[PDB]
Amino acid sequence: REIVHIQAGQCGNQIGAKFWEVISDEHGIDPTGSYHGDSDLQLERINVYYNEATGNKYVPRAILVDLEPGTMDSVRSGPFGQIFRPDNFVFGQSGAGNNWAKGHYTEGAELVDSVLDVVRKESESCDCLQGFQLTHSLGGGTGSGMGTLLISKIREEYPDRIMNTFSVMPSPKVSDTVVEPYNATLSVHQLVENTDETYSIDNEALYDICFRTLKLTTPTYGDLNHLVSATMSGVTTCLRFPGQLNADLRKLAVNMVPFPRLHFFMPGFAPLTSLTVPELTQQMFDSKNMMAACDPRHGRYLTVAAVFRGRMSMKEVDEQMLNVQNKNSSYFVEWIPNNVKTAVCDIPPRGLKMSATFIGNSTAIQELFKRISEQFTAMFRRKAFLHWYTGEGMDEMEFTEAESNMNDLVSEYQQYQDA
Amino acid sequence: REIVHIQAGQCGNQIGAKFWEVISDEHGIDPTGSYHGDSDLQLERINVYYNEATGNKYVPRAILVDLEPGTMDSVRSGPFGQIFRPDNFVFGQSGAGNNWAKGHYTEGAELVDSVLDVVRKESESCDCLQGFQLTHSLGGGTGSGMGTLLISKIREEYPDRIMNTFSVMPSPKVSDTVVEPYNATLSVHQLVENTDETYSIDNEALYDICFRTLKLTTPTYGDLNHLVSATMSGVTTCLRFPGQLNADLRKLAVNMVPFPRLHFFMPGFAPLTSLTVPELTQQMFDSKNMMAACDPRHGRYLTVAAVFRGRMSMKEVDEQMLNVQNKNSSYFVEWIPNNVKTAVCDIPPRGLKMSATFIGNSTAIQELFKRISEQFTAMFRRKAFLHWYTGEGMDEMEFTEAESNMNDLVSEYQQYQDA
Amino acid sequence: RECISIHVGQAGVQIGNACWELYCLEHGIQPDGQMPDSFNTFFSETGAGKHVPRAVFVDLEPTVIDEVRTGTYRQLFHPEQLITGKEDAANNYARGHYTIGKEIIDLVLDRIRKLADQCTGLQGFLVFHSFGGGTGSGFTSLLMERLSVDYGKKSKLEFSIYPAPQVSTAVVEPYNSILTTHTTLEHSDCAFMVDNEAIYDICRRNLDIERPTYTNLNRLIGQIVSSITASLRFDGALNVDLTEFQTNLVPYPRIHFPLATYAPVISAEKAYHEQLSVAEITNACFEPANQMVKCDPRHGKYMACCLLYRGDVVPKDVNAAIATIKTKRTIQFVDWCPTGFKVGINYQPPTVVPGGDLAKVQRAVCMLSNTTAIAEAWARLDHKFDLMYAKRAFVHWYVGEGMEEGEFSEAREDMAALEKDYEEVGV
Amino acid sequence: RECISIHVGQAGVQIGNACWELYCLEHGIQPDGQMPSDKTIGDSFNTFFSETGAGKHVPRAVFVDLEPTVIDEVRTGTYRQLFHPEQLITGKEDAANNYARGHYTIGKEIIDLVLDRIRKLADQCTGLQGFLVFHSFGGGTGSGFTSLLMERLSVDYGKKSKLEFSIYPAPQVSTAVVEPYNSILTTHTTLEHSDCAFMVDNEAIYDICRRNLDIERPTYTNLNRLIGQIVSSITASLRFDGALNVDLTEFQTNLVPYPRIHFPLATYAPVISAEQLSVAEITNACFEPANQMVKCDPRHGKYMACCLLYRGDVVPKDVNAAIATIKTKRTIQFVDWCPTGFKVGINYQPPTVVPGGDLAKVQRAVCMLSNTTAIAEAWARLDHKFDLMYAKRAFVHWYVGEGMEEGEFSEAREDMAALEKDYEEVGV
Amino acid sequence: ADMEVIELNKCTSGQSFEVILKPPSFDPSLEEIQKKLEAAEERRKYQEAELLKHLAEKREHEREVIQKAIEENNNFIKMAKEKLAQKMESNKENREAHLAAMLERLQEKDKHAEEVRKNKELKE
Ligand SMILES: Nc1nc2c(ncn2[C@@H]2O[C@H](COP(=O)(O)OP(=O)(O)OP(=O)(O)O)[C@@H](O)[C@H]2O)c(=O)[nH]1
Ligand SMILES: Nc1nc2c(ncn2[C@@H]2O[C@H](COP(=O)(O)OP(=O)(O)OP(=O)(O)O)[C@@H](O)[C@H]2O)c(=O)[nH]1
Ligand SMILES: Nc1nc2c(ncn2[C@@H]2O[C@H](COP(=O)(O)OP(=O)(O)O)[C@@H](O)[C@H]2O)c(=O)[nH]1
Ligand SMILES: Nc1nc2c(ncn2[C@@H]2O[C@H](COP(=O)(O)OP(=O)(O)O)[C@@H](O)[C@H]2O)c(=O)[nH]1
Ligand SMILES: COc1ccc(S(=O)(=O)Nc2cccnc2Nc2ccc(O)cc2)cc1
Ligand SMILES: COc1ccc(S(=O)(=O)Nc2cccnc2Nc2ccc(O)cc2)cc1
Ligand SMILES: [Mg+2]
């Protein structure tokens, strides 16, 4: 019925700035100005993502947190820079460190309040606030560190409303900080306890989709950001358009998750780069085409929501959806009955006549976690770089205490491949 | 010497509104106005059925009871509607339910008094009150339920005077409430204890007389009411005309019933629809021409009264009556001597030059009771729809307690086929 | 000396109403009461003009008594001599005797005494009543008990109407008959049964009336009764006064019931034939067809016989007539008793009711006999009874007004006795 | 006498919206409330409407939903004028697809206001009869709030029957995964506060629209129109006053033989698409699993009370000779201890259908309500889903979340177990 | 058969006389009891004055049945009243404490940042 957006940490902010302008285009928003488009639907659900100010204008419900100027002036001097409300920006000044502890304890909590102080305004302005969503990196500190904290402060203020995040689980290729495993694990723990759904976007997948299938040679943080932005568009749609269901994001959660701990979705997209229905369906259910690095083969689907875009007859969408539950009949847990629902929205994305998007509670996800915790316990081994955290006032055993907690979540997804 | 009339419950009130306008024609009464006819006899016995008010006017001694407006305004807006005294009508308002219990206990007893309250003022006005007669349905509640109650309140007030009813025992074709067996059985019990005579008019006969012998295709409650009204005229005549005997309705009872429990008469009529003496006699003693659904074959006649209409020499009526007590000599119990008496009145009914009517205490009647008690015990079986009564505060065993009582009355009519 | 009539019950009453009528025409009294000792036997000379009967009429409904104070004769009786009781007897002894009777009895018994009061030597009571039928059985009974108490010696002569299949009201008739007749029999002196059937038969053979009325039958009874009272209304030999009635008919206090037989019954239309001979009408008195209780005394015996002639007749024939009835007929006299034939002649030629059915005669006879075959009626009754009671057929209505199961037993048990009494005189 | 409608839940509501519409066209009421058709003063169609002010004709209805969205559509497109602004209640935050929420958490709040408004309507009724509660079987407020309502209605209204029209949820046209739970959850609380209950299998209706109506992939407002008709044919009895079925006890005195066994089986007569059928044929159509209205099969289970509800141009002369031959060439199937039914109700009012609708105008339509024992096919087809989720506490926690109890889930299923046994235990 | 006839009575307008024809040849009602016809009235009373006291019965059964309907109806209402808000005041109590045992699970990893944050105030 109305949602806010936190967008913290470079990787996070960069994801969001793309996010914002793709969805801003769908609706039709100038740099500031309101509407310019021959479509009409658009502004029925603009409510959800755009608190509106006097005159024309539309301004997104957006909070931007960072622990350095750097990546903020990057938005304000770039795409749809002009658009976010001035003191809706929360500057860091300090270091960010690429060190979870800094972001979660010292240099981060440091700030926290001036952030909460803004979320409080938007939220207590929202006529019936649904919940928040947040985008950020998992390895590297400002986004993952403060972010996990943020939510641990959001919940408690708002236990109440629901809790959504696109967090980008990181990989040993296309990354920088030897440390990321540490950072990620520490956050993984935090998330499992405090969110209601988390989209697991793997950079490992993301980079693979570019070079394994695109011929994209030297992939920027740019092309590759492109996927995430597109994926988030697809994912959000039903919150922000039609009048099909109406999608509570709460409705989404309760339906999508059997067990409280296991709120981890791998997403996935239709067409890609910078389409027929059938060729659209098995492209969205293709492994080599997931947003997370697993293979929805080893590991069955708990439950799956899916969403199709662009005026085409769904008399065919049923016929095909219903097909891949037989052409793959094995790989949907028989103990949750009709565990695939799909919906259709008839207004295409930026470019493209026909799209589709996949939301996926798969235990295939276990694959992802397991692979990070395997270069984590490979590092916490003879206690490697740990002294960067030890020293900031963190505990020796807090690390093992997260290992252990994550290591559980692995063996719970395993636990669900049952009868 | 002077009788009142209760006419309760839709079926009952519909019966009586026909009754009243046929007998009103015999005598000659306008909608209100008194006499208009070249006949003279008429008003000698108009005493018996018409308490008379100031000016000319004649107004029937009539009490009309129902638990809903509906069927009353139906009289007041129809045939001889204008004729019944204004506050001689007793409205229900409530539901009637087609549920004996409602009519006898709650929604009925509810009213009762405002009814008794009117019967009191007609009876304590009547110069020497003979007794009351009542017409009503036996399945379906307002009539059978309140009615049986009415009489149980009438006796007690007036033990004294005698107790007459045309009750219409109901059937599985030309009916509606799956429940009627229940209702009727409950009343049958009640009647057996509290009346002095009951004419058993079977709707099963009534319908059969229309379609087996009348070319009458889709029989209304209309044509079929026509029979009852005609049978009632014929039955009453001697109470309300000549000076042959003079028929006390008491005299009738004491002579017609050997045994206190067995006051159940099947009636029967002469010509029919909407005649010679011989052809009139074996038409009135034909089974296929009785008012109850039995065959005065299986079961002999206890006692029979019969009444002929229209100036024709009875020197032939003797000669023919005396005949069917030989052409059927077997089928009249030898242990009551001259058990057929007949009388003649020489003033024909609406239309018709020659008529005749049959009053019959036959143990053939056992046939009727047996047949209701056999779809009753077939229902009280696994205790069927009973919860409609259970719930209104009636007893589980009160049902078996009527079954048992009725089941007796069966095996007493059986008991009288003796020596 | 004097002589009070009581008529109880719709039959009782109409019989009366239509034999009082005949007394009048016979005594030339105009309906108003005025005529322009002797016949004082039955009427009181009231006021100065009138001639009122010494009669009481009782019924438990108005209807019938009302008809009397309606159509002329309205003037004859006195408003007080007619008693009426609002609610019916409803066809049962029980009701009349005990329930609806208890109430009116004190008033009737009083009024009777009002009539007895102006009688210097009243003789008896002539009670007319229906045998079966409601008040006729029940109230009559209660009457006779009480009359037997307030009036010591004073004879009572009953004229019962023995009920007949074809002209009847009630199914329960047998019960009442046997019921009353039981209480009633030891309070009465001599009792003239009248079989309704018998009379309806006469009206069919002799009078030619296709299907006779009550008021048809009644006129005929009228005559016979008028012929029996004749003796004491005019005065002349044999049955001159009420005691002589039993002296000549009842040799056994129990055996009351004599058999009557009127003489010449013929329809005006025949009113001008040649008259019938002293001989022939005597020889008519012997014939089951001219009888008055459907039976047949050729088979049963006789125990006292009484030729009661009316008209223009010298005995010298009556003799030579009896004489030949013996020689070509059925003698049949019992064991221990002369051979009867006490013979009464009254010179008064018989008048009949003017627009009636019968014709004016020169000579009529009457024949009262105490035969033992009159007990044919006594069983023909019982058998009906026996066979209802054998299933308590209607019994309950009686126990209902408050009688006893045992009374029914112990009343029949008396007819059983009687029937034995009777046939024991043979054979 | 009178008769209040209650519609709770997105389904509940739309079903309503689209049979109230049908009531209107059947009674010649222009959306603008006024009828130049006979008129009024403040009987006949008064059963369902109150003659408000001097011109108008408002339904005796309340519409509740815990989101606006759906109720807002009503005060949007004509009919906007029909109801009264108060009669439509809306609750800001959703039910979120769970009984728990509807009944305890987000319901707790709105119930007082709804129960009040109902009374307002009951207040102008000289002898109100009952309540017709329309709601979704699975689904959030339809299960949870409907339940809480009936409990409370059962308290504020003693005798006063309650008739529920449930929408039994179907795989193909469904919202929620947790549907089974809600269905079996509600149905349990719900069952001893209701008198007789008309189930409507969404599947079944969607099936009819595919065989008989020819609609490739049918809408909600496609199905709704069809439900409209059936409901309209059931309410018909007491909106004109017609020969048999004449009040709310008496109408059902007929159907339910036991305090439990409420659920009769409906079967609409001739369904055919615009762009005549014999009295005989349409009767013999009422007996056919394809024309049914809860996907089952009563050729195998028995029958315990049956009710032919005709509408239109028909003399019983045939209805008789028609039943007759339905007995000689078919499946008799009547239980042990109960005449052989066929209470027959004719209303002369020829059936009008929605103008630019899908169906055509008919000369004669039949309705057939039956209490078969085979309607418990739905009762397990549901349970089995339930059973097999709960067997792993599949979504349970969301309910304990809004504050329910583990045990309630046990003890609600423990009641269908009972019912399922109750039912099949009525066999000869 | 040939007479000899004695002769009683010659009269004004009449004559009597027997005629013996063949020789003969052979060899307490008092009153007391109308005390019967009241002892019959003391039955017509005992019989009526009972099928009266017998409707006295089949009446105050109405009493019973009209009253065990209401007796058993408010039985339902005022059982199903507290069948609610005692299974709903165990419900608001249920969540609220499950809300709080999430806040006490969250104030406890909040008094934990406080104890390592001023633990940075320990490292040299
Ligand atoms: N001979 C003769 N017999 C009659 C007459 N009326 C009735 N009866 C007979 O008398 C018997 C019926 O007696 P009722 O006098 O009618 O009975 P009741 O109770 O005395 O008189 P009610 O008060 O009218 O009932 C039957 O056997 C009839 O055949 C009549 O007028 N003449
Ligand atoms: N027949 C029919 N069924 C519907 C309709 N809408 C939803 N349903 C069904 O109803 C169930 C869902 O019930 P809902 O009314 O949507 O749930 P709710 O909580 O009561 O309503 P919301 O507040 O919108 O969530 C599913 O079984 C759907 O198939 C409709 O318009 N017609
Ligand atoms: N897809 C996406 N991921 C990024 C981007 N930039 C960095 N990342 C990933 O996120 C991790 C570090 O996030 P970063 O923003 O530097 O952390 P922070 O600035 O301290 O909050 C790296 O391991 C990257 O793989 C971005 O441009 N897009
Ligand atoms: N003959 C006659 N019987 C009727 C009539 N109406 C109903 N019945 C019978 O009586 C029964 C129901 O009587 P009803 O009047 O509805 O009961 P009530 O109104 O509750 O007293 C049915 O079984 C019918 O067969 C009528 O019009 N005439
Ligand atoms: C597969 O189980 C379900 C069933 C229903 C739902 S829903 O009523 O919440 N809506 C929905 C159905 C299909 C696809 N997307 C849905 N909503 C939605 C809302 C927000 C998102 O970010 C993504 C999807 C979600 C999951
Ligand atoms: C066959 O047994 C009898 C004998 C006499 C009577 S009666 O004296 O009560 N009258 C009577 C005789 C024949 C026919 N009808 C009679 N009366 C009557 C009175 C009221 C009625 O409703 C019907 C008939 C009744 C039944
Ligand atoms: Mg009715």
Side-chain angles (χ1 to χ4, degrees), chain B residues 164 199 235-236 238-239 245 247-253 255-256 303-307 338-343 359, chain C residues 91 169-171:
Chain B
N164 190 343
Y199 294 85
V235 166
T236 39
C238 343
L239 290 169
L245 336 111
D248 289 40
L249 181 67
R250 163 104 89 269
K251 243 197 189 62
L252 191 280
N255 252 100
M256 272 308 296
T303 70
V304 160
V307 60
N338 333 68
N339 64 156
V340 96
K341 300 283 186 260
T342 43
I359 261 164
Chain C
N91 272 333
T169 322
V171 161

Side-chain angles (χ1 to χ4, degrees), chain B residues 90-120 122 124-167:
Chain B
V90 218
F91 281 117
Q93 241 28 66
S94 342
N98 252 254
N99 154 303
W100 192 85
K102 276 184 192 182
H104 200 93
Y105 292 98
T106 28
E107 321 267 27
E110 173 65 279
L111 171 49
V112 147
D113 277 53
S114 297
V115 196
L116 247 81
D117 263 286
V118 179
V119 330
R120 228 180 269 95
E122 290 276 0
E124 287 184 73
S125 154
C126 247
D127 152 282
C128 141
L129 162 90
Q130 217 177 288
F132 327 70
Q133 56 161 240
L134 153 82
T135 49
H136 67 300
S137 50
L138 237 33
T142 117
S144 77
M146 211 195 251
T148 38
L149 178 51
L150 260 228
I151 106 255
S152 296
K153 281 226 80 185
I154 294 305
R155 287 266 230 69
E156 191 195 35
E157 269 236 47
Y158 302 125
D160 217 3
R161 328 288 9 165
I162 66 122
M163 236 307 115
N164 190 343
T165 98
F166 305 86
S167 348

Side-chain angles (χ1 to χ4, degrees), chain C residues 54-66 68-210 212-274 276-297 299-321:
Chain C
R54 293 238 209 69
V56 338
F57 276 18
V58 244
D59 200 8
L60 282 95
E61 70 194 300
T63 325
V64 210
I65 291 317
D66 271 51
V68 205
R69 27 176 174 226
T70 220
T72 1
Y73 291 154
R74 192 203 11 165
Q75 296 285 248
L76 205 46
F77 306 35
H78 234 92
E80 74 264 279
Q81 320 168 2
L82 319 170
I83 311 119
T84 149
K86 219 240 280 252
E87 170 143 49
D88 223 315
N91 272 333
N92 73 319
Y93 171 95
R95 195 118 127 124
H97 193 85
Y98 299 116
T99 323
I100 203 93
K102 194 183 205 276
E103 304 305 312
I104 250 66
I105 209 271
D106 274 75
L107 191 39
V108 184
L109 212 110
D110 173 34
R111 237 163 263 312
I112 264 134
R113 225 126 141 58
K114 235 134 119 85
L115 280 187
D117 269 34
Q118 81 243 333
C119 288
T120 40
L122 151 71
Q123 201 170 250
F125 296 107
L126 293 199
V127 171
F128 293 69
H129 72 306
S130 12
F131 229 162
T135 89
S137 49
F139 180 72
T140 305
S141 185
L142 189 73
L143 232 216
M144 302 275 303
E145 325 232 271
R146 276 291 290 272
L147 282 149
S148 228
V149 173
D150 291 62
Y151 298 104
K153 312 149 265 32
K154 327 269 233 192
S155 354
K156 292 170 225 80
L157 250 80
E158 93 189 17
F159 276 81
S160 313
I161 281 103
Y162 178 86
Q166 59 267 282
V167 198
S168 97
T169 322
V171 161
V172 28
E173 222 114 65
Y175 283 166
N176 312 338
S177 260
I178 297 301
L179 256 174
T180 189
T181 219
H182 162 67
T183 2
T184 237
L185 120 138
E186 43 128 25
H187 292 108
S188 170
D189 283 85
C190 141
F192 293 133
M193 259 181 47
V194 175
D195 180 2
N196 248 203
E197 181 175 325
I199 299 288
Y200 164 114
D201 276 347
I202 275 69
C203 284
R204 284 198 54 230
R205 211 168 306 86
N206 312 277
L207 248 50
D208 187 359
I209 305 283
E210 240 229 28
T213 333
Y214 267 136
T215 43
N216 250 140
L217 275 45
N218 282 346
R219 280 179 187 330
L220 209 357
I221 301 137
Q223 215 82 15
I224 272 121
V225 185
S226 131
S227 259
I228 290 166
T229 26
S231 316
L232 4 97
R233 331 211 303 280
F234 301 92
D235 146 70
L238 170 275
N239 312 170
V240 70
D241 65 68
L242 262 212
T243 341
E244 184 144 35
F245 257 103
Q246 117 212 358
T247 272
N248 290 151
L249 295 196
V250 337
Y252 282 106
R254 251 200 141 197
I255 295 88
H256 303 152
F257 314 78
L259 207 240
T261 324
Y262 193 71
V265 265
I266 207 69
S267 30
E269 124 217 345
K270 267 140 187 186
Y272 282 113
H273 277 109
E274 185 127 68
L276 292 107
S277 52
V278 218
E280 247 178 63
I281 47 170
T282 310
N283 244 20
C285 284
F286 302 92
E287 166 64 36
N290 267 319
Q291 227 127 78
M292 228 223 13
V293 176
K294 215 48 224 304
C295 71
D296 143 64
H299 112 304
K301 348 243 171 213
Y302 267 90
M303 69 195 128
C305 214
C306 221
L307 284 181
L308 230 135
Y309 290 82
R310 282 194 63 192
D312 172 41
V313 170
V314 186
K316 197 263 133 100
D317 320 313
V318 161
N319 270 202

Side-chain angles (χ1 to χ4, degrees), chain A residues 249-286 288-310 312-314 316:
Chain A
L249 173 70
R250 166 106 88 272
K251 239 193 194 69
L252 191 277
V254 75
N255 256 91
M256 271 315 280
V257 262
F259 304 106
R261 303 184 101 272
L262 341 168
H263 56 87
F264 301 87
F265 308 158
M266 11 170 258
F269 211 44
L272 359 86
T273 218
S274 72
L275 14 134
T276 195
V277 181
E279 263 162 275
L280 185 128
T281 308
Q282 355 135 351
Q283 171 122 163
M284 161 216 334
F285 260 127
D286 192 16
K288 192 225 301 236
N289 223 287
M290 264 347 129
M291 274 336 109
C294 4
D295 189 337
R297 264 32 253 317
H298 4 240
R300 317 127 59 100
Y301 289 81
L302 240 351
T303 69
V304 157
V307 68
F308 285 49
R309 215 105 125 277
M312 93 284 233
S313 103
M314 35 83 255
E316 203 185 44

Side-chain angles (χ1 to χ4, degrees), chain A residues 53 55 57-122 124-127:
Chain A
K57 301 247 181 87
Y58 254 152
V59 306
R61 225 121 68 222
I63 274 131
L64 309 119
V65 217
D66 207 85
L67 281 130
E68 89 227 278
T71 58
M72 314 251 271
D73 305 15
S74 253
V75 199
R76 216 185 309 122
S77 261
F80 259 168
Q82 320 250 269
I83 205 154
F84 308 91
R85 182 124 55 59
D87 41 53
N88 257 122
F89 282 94
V90 220
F91 278 119
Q93 246 23 69
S94 351
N98 248 257
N99 153 298
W100 192 82
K102 276 183 189 180
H104 200 93
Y105 294 105
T106 30
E107 323 259 31
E110 169 69 280
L111 170 50
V112 144
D113 277 56
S114 301
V115 194
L116 245 87
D117 264 289
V118 181
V119 334
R120 221 180 278 97
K121 208 200 255 134
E122 295 279 0
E124 288 184 75
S125 156
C126 248
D127 152 283

Side-chain angles (χ1 to χ4, degrees), chain E residues 67 69-70 72-77 79-82:
Chain E
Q67 198 62 248
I70 292 124
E72 93 143 67
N73 191 76
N74 7 268
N75 216 287
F76 174 61
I77 257 113
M79 164 237 102
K81 203 182 132 187
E82 99 255 306

Side-chain angles (χ1 to χ4, degrees), chain A residues 13-35 37-53 55 57-122 124-168 170-211 213 215 217-286 288-310 312-314 316-319:
Chain A
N13 270 96
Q14 206 62 98
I15 247 93
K18 253 10 109 186
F19 170 105
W20 272 115
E21 89 192 72
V22 189
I23 103 157
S24 242
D25 195 66
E26 244 119 85
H27 294 259
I29 286 127
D30 315 346
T32 5
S34 48
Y35 192 37
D38 231 73
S39 281
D40 197 15
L41 278 267
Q42 352 241 265
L43 332 167
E44 292 243 294
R45 286 268 154 102
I46 204 140
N47 212 3
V48 130
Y49 271 108
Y50 294 88
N51 240 317
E52 14 131 321
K57 301 247 181 87
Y58 254 152
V59 306
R61 225 121 68 222
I63 274 131
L64 309 119
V65 217
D66 207 85
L67 281 130
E68 89 227 278
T71 58
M72 314 251 271
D73 305 15
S74 253
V75 199
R76 216 185 309 122
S77 261
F80 259 168
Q82 320 250 269
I83 205 154
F84 308 91
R85 182 124 55 59
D87 41 53
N88 257 122
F89 282 94
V90 220
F91 278 119
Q93 246 23 69
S94 351
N98 248 257
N99 153 298
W100 192 82
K102 276 183 189 180
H104 200 93
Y105 294 105
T106 30
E107 323 259 31
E110 169 69 280
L111 170 50
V112 144
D113 277 56
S114 301
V115 194
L116 245 87
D117 264 289
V118 181
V119 334
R120 221 180 278 97
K121 208 200 255 134
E122 295 279 0
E124 288 184 75
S125 156
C126 248
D127 152 283
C128 147
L129 162 89
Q130 220 176 287
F132 327 72
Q133 59 162 245
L134 152 86
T135 51
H136 66 291
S137 41
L138 234 34
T142 112
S144 69
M146 213 199 248
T148 41
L149 179 53
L150 259 232
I151 103 249
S152 301
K153 283 227 81 187
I154 290 303
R155 279 269 230 68
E156 184 195 43
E157 269 238 50
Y158 303 128
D160 224 7
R161 325 288 15 164
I162 64 122
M163 237 307 119
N164 190 343
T165 96
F166 301 89
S167 354
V168 282
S171 129
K173 45 156 94 134
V174 133
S175 110
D176 47 302
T177 333
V178 263
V179 321
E180 287 148 57
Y182 279 23
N183 277 319
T185 315
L186 279 158
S187 308
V188 139
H189 186 318
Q190 210 79 240
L191 284 167
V192 91
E193 319 271 358
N194 295 303
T195 44
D196 295 297
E197 327 116 344
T198 281
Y199 292 84
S200 324
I201 323 88
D202 212 294
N203 273 248
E204 179 77 36
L206 239 29
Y207 181 104
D208 264 285
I209 259 131
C210 301
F211 205 19
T213 17
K215 300 195 173 242
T217 295
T218 311
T220 330
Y221 271 112
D223 48 347
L224 160 112
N225 256 323
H226 197 196
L227 274 338
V228 205
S229 59
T231 286
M232 282 186 277
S233 181
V235 168
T236 40
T237 22
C238 340
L239 289 173
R240 47 172 206 88
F241 259 120
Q244 52 217 12
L245 335 115
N246 16 49
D248 290 37
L249 173 70
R250 166 106 88 272
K251 239 193 194 69
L252 191 277
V254 75
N255 256 91
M256 271 315 280
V257 262
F259 304 106
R261 303 184 101 272
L262 341 168
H263 56 87
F264 301 87
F265 308 158
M266 11 170 258
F269 211 44
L272 359 86
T273 218
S274 72
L275 14 134
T276 195
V277 181
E279 263 162 275
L280 185 128
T281 308
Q282 355 135 351
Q283 171 122 163
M284 161 216 334
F285 260 127
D286 192 16
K288 192 225 301 236
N289 223 287
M290 264 347 129
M291 274 336 109
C294 4
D295 189 337
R297 264 32 253 317
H298 4 240
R300 317 127 59 100
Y301 289 81
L302 240 351
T303 69
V304 157
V307 68
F308 285 49
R309 215 105 125 277
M312 93 284 233
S313 103
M314 35 83 255
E316 203 185 44
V317 177
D318 291 1
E319 181 161 282

